[model samples]
Target chain A: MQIFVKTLTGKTITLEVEPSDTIENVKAKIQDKEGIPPDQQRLIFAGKQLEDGRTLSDYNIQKESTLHLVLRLRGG
Target chain B: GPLGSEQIGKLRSELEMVSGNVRVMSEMLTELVPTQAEPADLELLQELNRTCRAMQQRVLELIPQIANEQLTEELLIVNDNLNNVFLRHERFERFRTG
Candidate 1:
C-alpha cells in the first residue's frame, strides 16, 4: 500500500509499505528520506497519534492514507 | 437538521483531509514562483488546485449539517484558510500572465 506523510511545512512524502508495517518501521523510512530521526517524528492519522509498536493495519491505515508528521520538541 | 456527533466527527475528519491537501498545494504555489514557473508546472498546479477546491467544496456542503458550536468554530478557521488558498491561486495566475 502507498501512504503519505505530510509535514507541518506542507511537504508530503510518499511511502510504499505493507499493512503489517509497524509505525516505527514507517518512521524509519521517513528518516531515510528526510533525515528526521524516528524518535523526533510523531505521526497522526484521523486525529489519533500513532504508536511505535502498532502496525498500520492496527489503525486501519489503507492505501492513499495521509498521516500528519509533527516534529517532537527536544529538551536540553 | 443538525448532524449528530458521529456525522460531525466525519465532517471534521474530512475537513482535516482537505486542509492537508490545501496546505500541500500552498507549498507548491510557493515553490512555483510566478516569475519562474513553467507551463507544465502551472498545469500541475491547476490540477492540484482543482482537486483541493473540489475537496473543500464537499466539506463546505457538509458544514451546513453541523450544529455543534466547537465544530462551527473549526469550520470557520478552515474556511478562512481555504479562502487564502483561493486568493493565492488567483495571485499566481495574475502574475504568471504578466
Candidate 2:
C-alpha cells in the first residue's frame, strides 16, 4: 500500500509498504526520508495517537492512506 | 544625583505614547488582512509574514546594543508581545479556504 507522510513544515513524503509494516517501521522509514529522530516523533491520526507498536492493519490503514507526522523540537 | 520621580513619570508617559502608536500599527496590520477568500489574500499574508520576520531580525540586531538589564527585559517584553500578535495574524491567514 502507498502511504503519504506529511511533516510539520508542510512537506509531504510518499512511500509504499506492506500490510505487515508496524508503526515503528514506518517511523524508521520517515527518519530515513525526513531525517527526523524517531525519539522525538509524534504521529497523530484523527487527533489521536497512532501509537508505537501498532501495525498498519491495527489502524485499518488501507491503500493510498495519508498519515500526518509532526516532528517536535525542544526549546522555544 | 539622578532625575526625580516626577521626571521618571514624564519619561514613562512619553514611552506610553510611543507604545500606543506601535499598538495602533499592530492593530491596523491585523485588520487589513482579509478574513475570507480573496485574490490578494495570499499576497497580503506573504507580506505580513515577511514583515514579521524582518521585525524579528531587527530585534535580534538591537539586542546586543541594549546592555542595560532593564532595557533588555523591556525589549524582550516587546518582542514577546509582537510575537503573540504575529501568531494571531498567522492563524487568521490560515483562514484561507473559506
Candidate 3:
C-alpha cells in the first residue's frame, strides 16, 4: 500500500509500504527522500503520535492516509 | 529557509487567529440557519463563507512559503489547526442543515 507524508512546508512525500511497516521504517524512507534523520522526525495521524515500534496497521493507517511530519524536539 | 523562529511564531499566531475567526463565523451562521435567515442574511452568510475560505487558502499557501527545517514543529501545529478548522466547518454544515 501507499501512504502520504505531508511536511510542514506543504510538500507531500509518498511512500510505498506494507501495513506491517513500522513507523521507524517509514521514517527511514522519509529520511531517504528528505535527508532528515529518522530520530529527528515525528509522524502524526488522526491526532495520535506514531511510535517507532508501532506498525501502520497498529494505527489503522491505510492506503492514501495522510500523515503529518514534524520535527522531534529535544532538550537543549 | 529564511524565516526565523520568531517569524514562524508570528505566522502560527496569525494562522490560529484566522482559524478562530472561521469557527466563530461558522457558529454564527449555524445559529442564523435555525432562525430562517432572510435572503439578504443568507447572502451575507455566503459572502462571509467565501471570504473565510479565501483567508484559509492564503494561510495554507504560506505553509510552503515559510516552511523551514527550523520551524517544522510550529508549521505542523498550524497545519493541524487548519485541518481542524475545516473539519469543524463540515460539522457545522451538517448540523445547520438538519
Candidate 4:
C-alpha cells in the first residue's frame, strides 16, 4: 500500500508500505529519507497518534491517506 | 554553531524576560482592541500575530538549552532575536496601529 505523508509546511511524499508495516518501521524509513529520527518524529493520522508497534492495517489506513509528520525541535 | 547556553543565572533571567514578553504579546493584543480595521489591515495584524507566536515558541523551546554551555552562543542569538522582535512590536504599538 502507499500513503502520502505531509510535513508541517505541507511538503509531502509517498510512502510505500506493506499492510503489516508497523509505525516504527515507517518512522525508520522517514528518518532515512528526511534525517529526522524515529524517536523524534510524531506521526498523526485521522487526528490520532500512530503508535510504534501498530500495523498500518490496524488503523484501516488506505492508499493516498495523509499522515502528518511532526518533528521534535531541538533544545537542551 | 555560534553559541551555547552557559551562565545559567543569566540565561534564566533573560529567558524569564522572553517568556514574559511572549505572554504580553499574546494576551495584551486581545485586550487592546483596535475598533475598526479594513480587511487588509486585519490580515496584516493576523500575520504579525502568527509570526510572533511562532517566534515566541521558538524562544521557549530553547529555554531548556540555555544552560547547556555547548549551546550558549546559539541560544544567545535566539534570545537576542526574540528581544529584538519584542522591541519592534512595542515600538509599533506606541507609535502606530492600524
Candidate with the greatest DockQ versus the true structure = 1
Candidate with more favorable, higher TM-score: 1 or 4: 1
RMSD to native for every prediction? 13.4, 16.6, 14.6, 14.3
Chain A vs. native, model 3, TM-score:
0.91
Highest TM-score: give the candidate number: 1
User: lDDT tens string, model 4, A1-76?
Assistant: 8898776443565888887899999999888877888888867665355789998889888787777675544551
Q: Predict model 2's lDDT versus the native.
A: 0.61
The digit string of per-residue lDDT tens for model 4 on B1-98 reads 12342355555565554444344344334433445434433443454456556766776676564455545565556666656656755654665564
User: For candidate 2, what is the DockQ-based docking class?
Assistant: incorrect
> How do the residues A1-76 of candidate 3 rate in per-residue lDDT, one tens digit apiece?
9898865443668899999999999999898888989988867675345789999999999999978675644641
Look at candidate 2 and give me any clashing residue pairs: none
lDDT value, residue A64 of candidate 2: 84
**Candidate 1 residue lDDT tens string, A1-76:** 8999887554779999999999999999999989999988868776456799999999999999988786654741
Candidate 2 Cα deviation (angstroms), residue A3: 0.6
Candidate 4, TM-score vs. the true structure? 0.44
Q: Give a tens-digit lDDT track for model 3, residues B4-98.
A: 45575566556555654454445444445434555544443454456567766775676567646655555556556556656655665576576
Candidate 4 Cα outliers beyond 4 Å, as residue runs: B1-98
Cα misplacement distance, residue A76 of candidate 4 (Å): 8.6
List the global CA lDDT of all models. 0.76, 0.61, 0.66, 0.62
- Candidate 3: Cα lDDT at B37: 52
Q: Each predicted complex: what DockQ? A: 0.05, 0.01, 0.02, 0.01
TM-score of each: 0.54, 0.43, 0.46, 0.44
Q: Write model 1 residue lDDT over B48-72, tens digit each, in one string.
A: 5777677667657766777777776
lDDT of 4: 0.62
lDDT of 3 at B33: 49
Error of 4 at B32 (Å): 32
